[PDB]
Design a protein around this ligand. Structure first.
Ligand SMILES: Cc1cc2nc3c(=O)[nH]c(=O)nc-3n(C[C@H](O)[C@H](O)[C@H](O)COP(=O)(O)O)c2cc1C
Ligand SMILES: [Ca+2]
Ligand SMILES: [Ca+2]
Length: 362
């Protein structure tokens, strides 16, 4: 096969997976799980509708009950949940698509009202996040999470591993480790949330240890090239920050090479991050260190996407917002068609409205 100019619509070889284009559907929490946090027919339709994506990353999905921080997010810990997700993966596959499950644990970003037996959210350190959390009794302030004991860490790792094994049984093509957006793995990574004094805190190699041990466990379940990791090096979402972001995420980028992963997925800096002035980590910093497939994300367009692909800054481009509103986003981007405008009042929770009722092209 001859040399060609690559763009958003070029095929890609993601391990054994043949991606029809470079367009990825970002993971998107929609809070529309059914009873017992089990996916159902409506969720299958939703993902099925978007199967023209080169790859779908499914919404954040908790690997364990303690890992839930928002009502009606799906889980991947129970047989009923596995059955539910199988319905989703079958539908995506019948539609000729590919889908990875994003494996979740919210850590301190939860509330006792959402925890089993009203227990405490767990975290690297007993540090209460600022602001409020939505519970069934309206908005309540966060409480101080419970700091995990050192000998509790193998249990967390087992929770991810079991979650990944369940995703495998549920027919997914791969998994993405949610190490971003201020949730549990991210909480351990960054020193604003991690003030431990054992082998999981302090020096960067310690702060990275949970992520690396979780990654190792999951590659004992999946072929490593079906395992991805998502980071948000510049994000402050959920009251998280790191004193030396370049050092921290630079180290992680390099350390992940030994695992021969499917990809590294970067949620890039939003305007809020620059304007409130945390150190912005350039994606090029991570591109120079992680040697495998790189997915970039955050406010991308057809033009910005072609740009990063053509100039080799990234290999895949994930879209979030635009996939909510445009189920056939790849087709529309290709022909420069008009795009449906997303309705943020229906991003979270509810039913088919603002979920499955966005119209296909023409
Ligand atoms: C409604 C909504 C739900 C999201 N859910 C997740 C999620 O479950 N896991 C995750 O890593 N990121 C999640 N994100 C962040 C997006 O995946 C993405 O990085 C962000 O929307 C920026 O991409 P975009 O500009 O293309 O929308 C969510 C974003 C939105 C708006
Ligand atoms: Ca193949
Ligand atoms: Ca290098």
């Amino acid at each position: 096969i001859m040399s060609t100019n690559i763009n958003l619509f070029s095929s890609y070889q993601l391990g054994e997976l043949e991606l029809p284009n470079r367009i990825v559907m970002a993971p998107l929490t929609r809070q529309r799980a059914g009873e017992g946090n089990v996916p159902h027919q409506l969720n299958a339709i939703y993902y099925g509708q978007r199967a023209s994506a080169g790859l779908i990353i499914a919404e954040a999905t908790q690997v364990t009950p303690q890992g839930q921080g928002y009502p009606h997010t799906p889980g991947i810990h129970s047989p009923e949940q596995v059955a539910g997700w199988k319905l989703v993966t079958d539908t995506v596959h019948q539609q000729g698509g590919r889908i990875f499950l994003q494996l979740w644990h919210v850590g301190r970003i939860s509330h006792p009202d959402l925890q089993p037996d009203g227990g405490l959210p767990v975290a690297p350190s007993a540090i209460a996040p600022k602001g409020e959390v939505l519970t069934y009794e309206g908005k309540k302030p966060y409480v101080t999470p419970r700091a995990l004991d050192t000998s509790e860490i193998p249990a967390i790792v087992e929770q991810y591993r079991q979650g990944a094994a369940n995703a495998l049984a549920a027919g997914f093509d791969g998994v993405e480790i949610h190490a971003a957006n201020g949730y549990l793995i991210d909480q351990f990574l960054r020193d604003g949330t991690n003030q431990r004094t054992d082998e999981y805190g302090g020096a960067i190699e310690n702060r990275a240890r949970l992520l690396l041990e979780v990654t190792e466990a999951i590659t004992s379940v999946w072929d490593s090239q079906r395992v991805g990791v998502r980071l948000s090096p510049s994000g402050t979402f959920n009251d998280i920050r790191d004193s030396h972001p370049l050092e921290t995420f630079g180290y992680v980028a390099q350390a992940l090479n030994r695992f021969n992963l499917s990809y590294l997925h970067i949620f890039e800096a939003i305007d809020a991050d620059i304007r409130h002035g945390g150190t912005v980590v350039p994606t090029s910093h991570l591109r120079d260190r992680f040697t495998g497939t790189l997915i970039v994300n955050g406010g991308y367009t057809r033009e910005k996407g072609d740009t990063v692909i053509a100039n080799k800054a990234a290999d895949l481009v994930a879209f979030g917002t635009l996939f909510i509103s445009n189920p056939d986003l790849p087709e529309r981007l290709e022909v420069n068609a008009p795009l449906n405008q997303a309705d943020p009042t229906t991003f979270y929770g509810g039913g088919e409205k603002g979920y499955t009722d966005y119209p296909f092209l023409a």
